[PDB]
Amino acid sequence: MGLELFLDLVSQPSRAVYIFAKKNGIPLELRTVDLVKGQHKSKEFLQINSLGKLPTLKDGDFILTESSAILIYLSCKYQTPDHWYPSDLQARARVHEYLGWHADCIRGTFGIPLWVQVLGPLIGVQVPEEKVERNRTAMDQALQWLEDKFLGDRPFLAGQQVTLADLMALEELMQPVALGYELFEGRPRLAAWRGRVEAFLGAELCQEAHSIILSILEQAAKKTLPTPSPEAYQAMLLRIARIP
Amino acid sequence: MGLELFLDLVSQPSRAVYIFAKKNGIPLELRTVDLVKGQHKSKEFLQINSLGKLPTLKDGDFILTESSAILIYLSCKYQTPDHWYPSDLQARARVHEYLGWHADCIRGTFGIPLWVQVLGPLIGVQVPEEKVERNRTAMDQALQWLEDKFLGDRPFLAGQQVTLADLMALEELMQPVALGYELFEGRPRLAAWRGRVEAFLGAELCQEAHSIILSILEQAAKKTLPTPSPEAYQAMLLRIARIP
Ligand SMILES: N[C@@H](CCC(=O)N[C@@H](CSCc1cccc2ccccc12)C(=O)NCC(=O)O)C(=O)O
Ligand SMILES: N[C@@H](CCC(=O)N[C@@H](CSCc1cccc2ccccc12)C(=O)NCC(=O)O)C(=O)O
């Protein structure tokens, strides 16, 4: 088959999807798309995903987006292990519920530090301290609900075994981390779950799945950051503009 | 069975879920939860849904949340018509992709007018003009991507026939409307799809599904609005606080 997977490993959902595929070893044609540069706006990329977003999966002439769908379609088409995306009514619901809450409270809330720290200043824009504080206190606020509301005493957000819910979560939460935010500091229930997930998944994977963002603060300083194209500049300006 | 459905028809997801169930006629014990009042924070409600959010479905001793999950679990358990939540790979993905994008760009963006106009002032807080403008220009921006990116020339966001994607969408979009925003004004592609969905669903349903929010601006003025409990106050304070 060789369905192409256009992503940028600096993008948390992009990561999550890339860990699933490989970990469940799926033939994929990893087509890098430089977000920071603005490749995801190149007229040529827009002929594949009108929205100009990452990651987008091109299977056949069927171009799908949103990691949630991508992963699930992946899991389905590629009959991956059941524990991943269960078939049990109660089961699946628990993932669909998290992925529903994840996109509300986690998504867009745990990637702000990069804009405050790297992307923002990349285009001369400085984010307001208040928004910075407000966002961080907004983070743990999520981390708690994620800590005791979903995780609880069980081993996983979505239940008993690893699930896309955990792949999404842990990836999203890896950004503030790689930036210098140790969110698992005062959270053993959290530090453990993550490490539990990591354990299962494997070092070599996680050790390369991240990398890009782990070094990100460096290239930043060493100004190894590409200058965003006007199209990217816009979206960078919009994003920073919806920081509450 | 008689699984209970705790909701408030002033809450868009609450509506969407309530339209599916009845329209596909499912035994439901509609347990009203006054959001504006703060019943969704009553210690008693919290013993049902720790998060204190609406809607939450109590089937058996299995308490599920997030309309997405609820609806899907509903559809499944209640083997509802296929067109709803397809079984076709390509098919389902298209819903899973929209509901993925819906939660990003539509959810949280199309309910701000109510806070700017009713709920905000309810507790003496006034939202800044900028946030107001910013949000509206942020709406159509969504309306366009929804208009031509998902809808396109086809009859539905998620494909050819009505689907939870359309139930969710149109409901979310009904709030700005009921408040005085005619989002289908300069949008025939949009005005039509909505009316097409409406057609299918039925007046009597939609004529009662909404109502609550349609009258909402009046009770507002005639001060028929209950005074929020301290717990509600907080949440309204937080919400208004994440208005970009
Ligand atoms: N719900 C879908 C949304 C994907 C998404 O928002 N993708 C973001 C990128 S992740 C975030 C991200 C990481 C690293 C560098 C970046 C530089 C510029 C902008 C975002 C960056 C996107 O496409 N953004 C482009 C856009 O929205 O225009 C999903 O989960 O996949
Ligand atoms: N992804 C899930 C989230 C549901 C949700 O956010 N529900 C909101 C209510 S909708 C929005 C809404 C409409 C009318 C009056 C309201 C008064 C106070 C707060 C919100 C109001 C909620 O539970 N909010 C409570 C909370 O988050 O604490 C879904 O789609 O169902």
UniProtKB/Swiss-Prot annotation, chains A, B:
GO biological process, one term: glutathione metabolic process
EC number: 2.5.1.18
Assigned GO CC terms: cytoplasm; cytosol; extracellular exosome
Keywords of the record: Cytoplasm, Transferase
Top-tier EC class: transferase
Annotated compartments: Cytoplasm, Cytosol
Any Pfam family the entry gives: GST_N
Reactions that this protein is recorded to catalyse: RX + glutathione = an S-substituted glutathione + a halide anion + H(+)
Residue span(s) of domain GST C-terminal: 88-224
Annotated residues for binding of glutathione: 40-41, 53-54, 66-67, 104-107
Tissues where the protein occurs: Expressed at low levels in liver. In lung, expressed at low levels in ciliated bronchiolar cells, alveolar macrophages and alveolar type II cells.
UniProt GO MF annotations: glutathione transferase activity
GST N-terminal domain ranges (all copies): 2-82
Predominant location category: cytoplasm
Cited SUPFAM superfamilies: GST C-terminal domain-like, Thioredoxin-like
Keyword Mitochondrion: no
Keyword Magnesium attributed: no
InterPro entries per the UniProt record, alphabetical: Glutathione-S-Trfase_C-like, Glutathione-S-Trfase_C_sf, Glutathione_S-Trfase_N, GST_C, GST_C_Theta, GST_N_Theta, GST_Theta, Thioredoxin-like_sf
Subunit structure: Homodimer.
Function: Conjugation of reduced glutathione to a wide number of exogenous and endogenous hydrophobic electrophiles. Has a sulfatase activity.
Sequence similarity: Belongs to the GST superfamily. Theta family.
Record-given protein name: Glutathione S-transferase theta-2B
Native species: Homo sapiens
Gene transcribed to yield this protein: GSTT2B
